[PDB]
Amino acid sequence: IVEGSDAEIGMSPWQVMLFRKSPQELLCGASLISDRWVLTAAHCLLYPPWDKNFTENDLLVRIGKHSRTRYERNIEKISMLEKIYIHPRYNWRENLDRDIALMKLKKPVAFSDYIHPVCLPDRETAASLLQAGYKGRVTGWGNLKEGQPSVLQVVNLPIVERPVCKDSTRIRITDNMFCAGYKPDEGKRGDACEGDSGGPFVMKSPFNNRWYQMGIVSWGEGCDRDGKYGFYTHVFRLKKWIQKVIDQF
């Protein structure tokens, strides 16, 4: 997270840490949608270009954390994966289209004051909040520039018009992703960076005062660059998929 700031303890209780067992290094971010289902970016588990391909037994999940490194006793809860589910349409070669994936925990997690699930959006919530100018919140223990934060970072970024998003990168944009961030003449700055992938792009509904995950930190050219913007996976367009996956398994 670039041009962000220290998060308020318990302000992102759905924030999950995708931790690699050996070597013990922070891999990506993720969101807690239920007691046994965690949502993250597919490119975090499978990205051949960097010979990246992890199995359930290779990864660890840390929930309710605020400190990036230190083990937060009696607060932090660690769970392990039973199965990984990467969308069959995930295109890792060209434009990381549908850069989403579900992770099923082996044992249900116990909710606390630091551990709680985020809401998935319905077609109505998605039709009200998904608009240019409408600001969303992004969190993660990713790089501060192109170094590493002490505690969880948070930044507020507005949704950008699709045309601007498209003409800002040479990559081919799809209906399964949206770009967010400030423009050059807007004065304010901020953006996500490496290690923030899988992190949620939540928005608070002014109709039921509930936080909804609308996007997933996917890709972007560099970090916090002028003219360039960060892209997030369109959660709603895939909910249908999420629903029947969590259902059948």
């Binding site: 308020e8 303890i9 318990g10 302000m11 209780p13 949608i33 239920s34 606390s112 004051d113 630091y114 709680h116 699930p117 985020v118 809401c119 998935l120 100018g133 409408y134 600001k135 969303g136 919140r137 948070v154 507020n156 507005p158 928005m203 608070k204 509904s205 002014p206 039921n208 005062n209 509930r210 936080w211 909804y212």
Partner: peptide, 28 residues
């Protein structure tokens, strides 16, 4: 799942975080 989007140290304590409003004030 039916109690989602409600933080126990905020919404459930009728308290706001310091940057929330920025988000709500962006709806025009």
């Amino acid at each position: 799942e039916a109690d989602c989007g409600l933080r126990p140290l905020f919404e459930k304590k009728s308290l706001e975080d310091k940057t929330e409003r920025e988000l709500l004030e962006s709806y025009i």
